[PDB]
Amino acid sequence: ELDEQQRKRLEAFLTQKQKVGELKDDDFEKISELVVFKVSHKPSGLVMARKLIHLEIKPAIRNQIIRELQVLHECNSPYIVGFYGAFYSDGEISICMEHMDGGSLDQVLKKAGRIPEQILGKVSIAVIKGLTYLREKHKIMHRDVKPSNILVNSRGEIKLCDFGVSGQLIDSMANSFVGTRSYMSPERLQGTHYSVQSDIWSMGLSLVEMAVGRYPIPPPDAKELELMPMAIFELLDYIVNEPPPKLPSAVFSLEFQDFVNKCLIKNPAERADLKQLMVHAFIKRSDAEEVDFAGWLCSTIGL
Amino acid sequence: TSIFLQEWDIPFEQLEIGELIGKGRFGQVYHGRWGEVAIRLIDIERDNEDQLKAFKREVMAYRQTRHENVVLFMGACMSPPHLAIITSLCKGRTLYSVVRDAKIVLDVNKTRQIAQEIVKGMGYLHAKGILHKDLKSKNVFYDNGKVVITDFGLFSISGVLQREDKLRIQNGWLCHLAPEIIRQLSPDTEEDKLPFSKHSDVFALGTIWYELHAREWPFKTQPAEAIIWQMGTGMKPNLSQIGMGKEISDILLFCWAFEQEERPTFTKLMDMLEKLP
Numbered sequence: 228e229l230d231e232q233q234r235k236r237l238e239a240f241l242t243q244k245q246k247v248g249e250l251k252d253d254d255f256e257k258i259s260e261l262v263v264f265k266v267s268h269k270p271s272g273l274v275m276a277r278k279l280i281h282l283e284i285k286p287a288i289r290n291q292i293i294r295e296l297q298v299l300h301e302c303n304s305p306y307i308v309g310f311y312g313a314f315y316s317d318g319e320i321s322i323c324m325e326h327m328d329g330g331s332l333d334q335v336l337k338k339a340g341r342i343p344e345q346i347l348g349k350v351s352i353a354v355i356k357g358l359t360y361l362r363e364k365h366k367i368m369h370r371d372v373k374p375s376n377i378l379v380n381s382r383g384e385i386k387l388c389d390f391g392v393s394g395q396l397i398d399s400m401a402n403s404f405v406g407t408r409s410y411m412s413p414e415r416l417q418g419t420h421y422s423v424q425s426d427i428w429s430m431g432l433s434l435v436e437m438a439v440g441r442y443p444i445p446p447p448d449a450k451e452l453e454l455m456p457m458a459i460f461e462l463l464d465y466i467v468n469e470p471p472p473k474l475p476s477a478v479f480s481l482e483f484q485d486f487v488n489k490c491l492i493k494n495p496a497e498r499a500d501l502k503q504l505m506v507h508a509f510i511k512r513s514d515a516e517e518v519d520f521a522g523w524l525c526s527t528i529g530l
Numbered sequence: 531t532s533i534f535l536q537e538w539d540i541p542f543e544q545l546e547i548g549e550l551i552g553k554g555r556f557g558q559v560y561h562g563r564w565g566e567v568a569i570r571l572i573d574i575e576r577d578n579e580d581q582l583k584a585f586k587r588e589v590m591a592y593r594q595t596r597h598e599n600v601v602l603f604m605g606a607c608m609s610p611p612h613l614a615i616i617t618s619l620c621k622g623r624t625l626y627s628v629v630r631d632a633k634i635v636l637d638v639n640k641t642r643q644i645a646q647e648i649v650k651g652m653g654y655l656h657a658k659g660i661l662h663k664d665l666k667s668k669n670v671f672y673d674n675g676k677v678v679i680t681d682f683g684l685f686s687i688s689g690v691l692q693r694e695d696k697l698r699i700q701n702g703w704l705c706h707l708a709p710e711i712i713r714q715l716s717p718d719t720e721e722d723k724l725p726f727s728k729h730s731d732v733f734a735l736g737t738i739w740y741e742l743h744a745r746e747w748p749f750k751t752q753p754a755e756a757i758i759w760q761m762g763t764g765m766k767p768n769l770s771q772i773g774m775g776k777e778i779s780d781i782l783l784f785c786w787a788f789e790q791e792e793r794p795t796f797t798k799l800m801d802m803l804e805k806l807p
């Protein structure tokens with residue numbers, strides 16, 4: 228639960244935050260769109276990413292908000308993207324974080340066809356150890372694990388982002404987006420009590436989407452797997468009542484197939500918990516593997 | 531192809547526009563003068579003749595409405611791309627803002643009354659063949675016992691749904707939607723083609739009745755995807771957790787009934803609300 232090559236990069240990040248101090252709108256110059264923007268801080272030669280959530284509420288709440296997003300200063304990990312500061316401007320709270328030049332895994336999967344099993348083995352450790360950090364050292368669960376919020380870079384780190392720290396920002400956001408891909412656990416959909424087991428399922432279903440190259444609900448028939456119009460409620464009712472999705476028997480090792488099957492168990496008590504997955508054959512095998520992640524990244528993305 | 535303001539029976543010499551009354555998803559709502567009035571300006575595409583003739587179909591209906599629990603439709607001038615709808619201005623606060631003010635007593639006799647006013651108003655709009663399609667406490671006004679419904683029929687022509695493959699859902703909307711509707715929300719759904727009915731409007735009254743006693747919306751804790759599944763399959767709260775008797779809680783079971791035909795008319799509901807203690 229500790230490396231030293233990893234210990235240099237975090238000590239290198241803790242020094243880059245001494246450089247910024249405090250923040251305000253005129254400090255930042257828009258570079259590119261990513262809602263989030265890749266922006267150029269001028270008081271510090273550090274390219275950040277800024278997320279801008281629109282909120283319209285009275286001042287006693289926006290200060291209660293920023294106080295709760297101060298927690299991300301304290302949390303620091305090689306499997307969690309770096310938090311700098313959180314300030315309010317122009318009817319929008321802005322969170323500036325570490326920028327990551329490879330993007331989310333859902334856009335690298337968008338450009339690649341499918342992600343080969345060996346790479347998916349590393350990321351699971353990232354995710355596995357990522358979430359285990361916040362449950363053990365902060366008593367928070369992520370609440371929104373999905374491909375769009377797993378970030379990669381040309382240096383080869385993988386970290387999580389976009390997680391549920393501020394219970395009042397949860398309440399203050401006015402409207403939510405729902406689409407054809409849901410990553411919500413069947414126990415959350417049904418309104419019953421939930422723990423980090425929901426994030427494990429959200430990881431399982433993310434892993435089979437990335438290994439197949441298609442969101443796996445509803446499951447494809449034999450015609451679409453050989454070559455490799457629905458309403459929200461029937462997708463969600465499929466997720467609760469139909470047997471969970473599963474990797475194709477032929478092309479993936481039996482350790483991997485089981486690894487997702489154990490994440491995609493419906494009963495959250497029988498589902499694998501955080502460190503049952505730490506000792507699973509599939510991640511013991513990938514741990515002691517040498518994959519050049521940065522190499523596969525820069526080669527298929529083009530950077 | 532146009533609607534002039536002299537086409538109305540309200541005598542109109544001059545119209546003044548004041549400050550903005552509030553933010554809203556559908557056009558803007560200004561203060562006005564005519565007496566004092568509420569001007570809702572909305573924008574359309576220059577040449578979308580199919581949605582504009584559909585809008586004239588609406589307002590001709592409202593020209594016939596007058597009822598003391600329904601906001602007074604006064605006029606509506608349509609010279610594209612700019613349109614306005616002019617109703618009288620409501621003194622006082624929204625039922626939404628009254629429900630959420632700690633300083634305000636909401637006893638079980640008074641909530642039984644505020645619900646009866648909405649029901650009367652809603653019987654009247656049904657009587658005339660007008661579905662509301664967006665009944666909610668932010669579209670009911672309350673001021674010392676007078677209760678006015680606003681924004682009826684707007685949702686048809688509204689466009690409050692408009693990202694890619696991702697339907698924008700605002701907090702509070704889904705828990706007013708009867709299941710026949712919830713089961714059909716897609717990222718392709720359009721407001722003009724959702725199956726509203728007199729039954730879906732009664733459902734939405736149920737959500738106000740819950741809200742009157744709970745002093746918050748139902749499904750307040752849960753995420754949106756959770757709400758869609760729970761409500762599509764029939765799962766509804768009750769009011770026993772805050773000590774409301776059988777009869778206050780029997781209202782909800784009738785209004786929120788899963789099969790539409792089991793939900794009352796507004797006339798029947800008016801009778802059921804008279805029989806409370």
Ligand SMILES: Cc1c(=O)n(C)c(Nc2ccc(I)cc2F)c2c(=O)n(C3CC3)c(=O)n(-c3cccc(NC(=O)CCOCCOCCNC(=O)CCC4=[N+]5C(=Cc6ccc(-c7ccc[nH]7)n6[B-]5(F)F)C=C4)c3)c12
Pocket residue numbers: 278296299307308309310322324366367368369370371387388389390391392393394396397751752753754
């Ligand atoms: C929250 C959220 C956020 O903060 N930031 C800061 C965001 N930005 C951001 C963050 C990091 C970084 I690097 C960079 C960033 F840009 C985001 C954000 O960017 N985006 C995306 C881009 C737009 C978000 O989408 N969201 C967001 C995320 C997750 C969820 C949501 N929405 C919902 O979930 C809606 C449904 O409503 C949930 C209501 O739940 C409130 C919490 N109530 C509980 O848990 C009660 C549980 C309970 N417990 C009991 C007893 C005990 C005993 C012990 C414990 C316990 C457990 C653990 C400790 N003790 N318990 B017990 F469990 F408390 C009894 C009951 C929205 C963002």
Ligand SMILES: Nc1ncnc2c1ncn2[C@@H]1O[C@H](COP(=O)(O)OP(=O)(O)NP(=O)(O)O)[C@@H](O)[C@H]1O
Pocket residue numbers: 261262263276278308324325326327328330331334371375376378388389
């Ligand atoms: N730190 C970051 N660096 C680079 N790209 C990012 C970063 N954070 C988010 N993005 C990208 O910005 C886009 C939107 O991200 P995000 O704000 O998380 O919304 P989303 O991915 O569509 N779903 P959600 O995270 O729940 O809002 C995606 O294309 C992400 O890959």
Ligand SMILES: Nc1ncnc2c1ncn2[C@@H]1O[C@H](COP(=O)(O)OP(=O)(O)NP(=O)(O)O)[C@@H](O)[C@H]1O
Pocket residue numbers: 551552553554555556559568601617618619620621624668669680681700
């Ligand atoms: N007749 C009226 N008299 C006074 N205020 C009004 C009237 N009609 C609307 N308003 C206010 O004008 C603003 C915009 O109205 P509207 O667009 O219906 O918002 P809303 O119905 O409250 N919320 P939403 O429909 O979810 O966007 C709100 O502050 C309303 O309370």
